[PDB]
Amino acid sequence: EDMAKIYGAVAAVSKNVNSSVTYEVKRGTHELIKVPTIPHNLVLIQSDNGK
């Protein structure tokens, strides 16, 4: 029983080893939008007689 407790403690510290890290690479990314209409700014001014 004493040996079982000693072997258990040793195995516990052997299992305390890291494997990897996982994360997300999202900094710098932004969401795009869509503009449906071209913003022209033209008006036509004509005289009453059309001259």
Partner: protein, 50 residues
Amino acid sequence: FALAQINADDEFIGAIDKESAEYLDEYATLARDISNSLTLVKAAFGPLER
């Protein structure tokens, strides 16, 4: 100045004999746990670094 003579009754002798058995068991138990501790430290620990 008032030294008292020592009386060794049968009760005192019997009490000491009980203590002898208790001390023997206590030393035996301590020795086993020292062995268990020494094995545990050697298998599970290493040296330190700065």
